Scaffold this active site. Sequence first.
Site, PDB file in Angstrom:
ATOM      1  N   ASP A 187      30.301  35.266  46.592  1.00 27.30           N
ATOM      2  CA  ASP A 187      31.645  34.688  46.399  1.00 27.30           C
ATOM      3  C   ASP A 187      32.286  34.320  47.723  1.00 27.30           C
ATOM      4  O   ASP A 187      33.499  34.487  47.915  1.00 27.30           O
ATOM      5  CB  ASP A 187      32.599  35.588  45.614  1.00 27.30           C
ATOM      6  N   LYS A 209      34.163  32.045  50.208  1.00 24.70           N
ATOM      7  CA  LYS A 209      35.093  30.919  50.215  1.00 24.70           C
ATOM      8  C   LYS A 209      36.269  31.315  51.095  1.00 24.70           C
ATOM      9  O   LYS A 209      36.473  32.509  51.332  1.00 24.70           O
ATOM     10  CB  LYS A 209      35.565  30.546  48.818  1.00 24.70           C
ATOM     11  N   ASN A 229      38.639  34.227  50.173  1.00 23.50           N
ATOM     12  CA  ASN A 229      38.150  35.597  50.234  1.00 23.50           C
ATOM     13  C   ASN A 229      37.938  36.105  51.663  1.00 23.50           C
ATOM     14  O   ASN A 229      37.312  37.166  51.859  1.00 23.50           O
ATOM     15  CB  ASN A 229      36.848  35.724  49.453  1.00 23.50           C
ATOM     16  N   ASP A 285      36.497  41.418  49.019  1.00 20.94           N
ATOM     17  CA  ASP A 285      36.278  41.561  47.582  1.00 20.94           C
ATOM     18  C   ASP A 285      34.799  41.396  47.265  1.00 20.94           C
ATOM     19  O   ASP A 285      34.174  40.408  47.661  1.00 20.94           O
ATOM     20  CB  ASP A 285      37.174  40.576  46.813  1.00 20.94           C
ATOM     21  N   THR A 307      32.186  30.417  42.527  1.00 21.77           N
ATOM     22  CA  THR A 307      33.277  29.453  42.470  1.00 21.77           C
ATOM     23  C   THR A 307      32.661  28.062  42.533  1.00 21.77           C
ATOM     24  O   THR A 307      31.768  27.834  43.355  1.00 21.77           O
ATOM     25  CB  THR A 307      34.253  29.694  43.646  1.00 21.77           C
TER      26      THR A 307
HETATM   27  N1  T82 Z   1      40.481  37.554  46.449  1.00 23.33           N
HETATM   28  C1  T82 Z   1      41.342  37.880  45.279  1.00 23.33           C
HETATM   29  C2  T82 Z   1      41.694  39.364  45.265  1.00 23.33           C
HETATM   30  C3  T82 Z   1      42.431  39.703  46.560  1.00 23.33           C
HETATM   31  O1  T82 Z   1      43.385  39.046  46.958  1.00 23.33           O
HETATM   32  N2  T82 Z   1      41.980  40.796  47.185  1.00 23.33           N
HETATM   33  N3  T82 Z   1      42.620  41.200  48.339  1.00 23.33           N
HETATM   34  C4  T82 Z   1      42.154  42.258  48.874  1.00 23.33           C
HETATM   35  C5  T82 Z   1      42.743  42.803  50.085  1.00 23.33           C
HETATM   36  C6  T82 Z   1      42.130  43.847  50.751  1.00 23.33           C
HETATM   37  C7  T82 Z   1      42.629  44.310  51.951  1.00 23.33           C
HETATM   38  C8  T82 Z   1      43.776  43.763  52.514  1.00 23.33           C
HETATM   39  O2  T82 Z   1      44.292  44.186  53.693  1.00 23.33           O
HETATM   40  C9  T82 Z   1      44.395  42.728  51.830  1.00 23.33           C
HETATM   41 BR1  T82 Z   1      45.988  41.980  52.544  1.00 23.33          BR
HETATM   42  C10 T82 Z   1      43.900  42.240  50.640  1.00 23.33           C
HETATM   43  C11 T82 Z   1      42.652  39.722  44.150  1.00 23.33           C
HETATM   44  C12 T82 Z   1      43.852  39.029  43.983  1.00 23.33           C
HETATM   45  C13 T82 Z   1      44.764  39.413  43.012  1.00 23.33           C
HETATM   46  C14 T82 Z   1      44.494  40.495  42.192  1.00 23.33           C
HETATM   47  C15 T82 Z   1      43.305  41.184  42.366  1.00 23.33           C
HETATM   48 CL1  T82 Z   1      42.982  42.580  41.402  1.00 23.33          CL
HETATM   49  C16 T82 Z   1      42.391  40.796  43.321  1.00 23.33           C
END
Ligand code: T82
Lengths: 18, 340
Positions: free
Chosen positions: B156, B158, B161, B174, B191
């Site tokens: 994934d 992109k 992410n 993620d 994606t």
């Molecule tokens: N990629 C999409 C993902 C996301 O935004 N993850 N973010 C992780 C993160 C980790 C560490 C960090 O310091 C930060 Br800031 C962010 C997601 C978006 C919305 C709901 C859910 Cl459940 C998951």
Amino acid sequence: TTYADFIASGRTGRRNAI
Amino acid sequence: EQESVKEFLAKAKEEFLKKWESPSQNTAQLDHFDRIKTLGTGSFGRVMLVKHKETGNHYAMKILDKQKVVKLKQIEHTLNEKRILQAVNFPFLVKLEFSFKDNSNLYMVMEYVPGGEMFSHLRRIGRFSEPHARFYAAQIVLTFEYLHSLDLIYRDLKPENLLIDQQGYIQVTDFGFAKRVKGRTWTLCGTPEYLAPEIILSKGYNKAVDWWALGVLIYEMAAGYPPFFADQPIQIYEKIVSGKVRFPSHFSSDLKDLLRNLLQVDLTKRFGNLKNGVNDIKNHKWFATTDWIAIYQRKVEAPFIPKFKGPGDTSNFDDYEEEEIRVSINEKCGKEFTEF
Ligand SMILES: NC[C@@H](C(=O)N/N=C/c1ccc(O)c(Br)c1)c1cccc(Cl)c1
């Protein structure tokens, strides 16, 4: 332009996974 | 130099496997934290900025609604992500600090990366220069070398992410779609813009799909738009399999040659999947100026540093309506998530 075609695609925002 | 990478990856695998076999569990609880702001929202969870009460440290907290996880058939992906995050250790992978669960939710507390997503910076600035793109690309190359040595396919990649930290370096966050598989796998996932042709064509595929996706990422970083786009995904898929691609006139010859070998439909010919493996990429002329060790050691001066106004600044994230975080009186979905 290719840029204009990209804007026209409507997929310029965050993209979801399938 | 070569034996040094071999020895590093062997030690890394030993450490990963120990943690994979014996995951950590239940290392904090919700009332240790104050909520500050919703940073992201999805169909079965949210990501919050939180402050740890005892220390005052800020963290990102991913909160998953167990019932919604079950409804949307994300049990295995959710357990897998947490199991991977607690076992890996690499400079460009976000660090898991705590995890726990309660009657309603699963919680993963991670290092807070205040610079936000590469996606936002890319759309704002338009496109990255080739040196800027190459700085990020080198980090992904090393990250995939690490992950692939653990037999993990990422699947994934992109800009959405990839987070940018206070030194301007990347953090991958993620891992729901990652799979620890040494041979082939078959799941349709990812994606659309970033899908390798062999995924679209319903083939059994392997870690080469990540190197295709690197090609898409490099292209998008340097052009400002991805190589294959259209109104609807079905239309994007036809372009991907066609094996035709055009480059902006400002792309260097070296960049085009690299991308022709990464965006290679014939996975018997794609860079990263040949006998020389990742070294076909690391030794390519486009990367000639890259000091691979210095990137790994985070000693290279980053070409871009996000604006940073404090340890809990959220200015690089979108704004969302703040919704309650309810914890039910009844335990939900206990058996499904016992290993979390
Ligand atoms: N990629 C999409 C993902 C996301 O935004 N993850 N973010 C992780 C993160 C980790 C560490 C960090 O310091 C930060 Br800031 C962010 C997601 C978006 C919305 C709901 C859910 Cl459940 C998951």
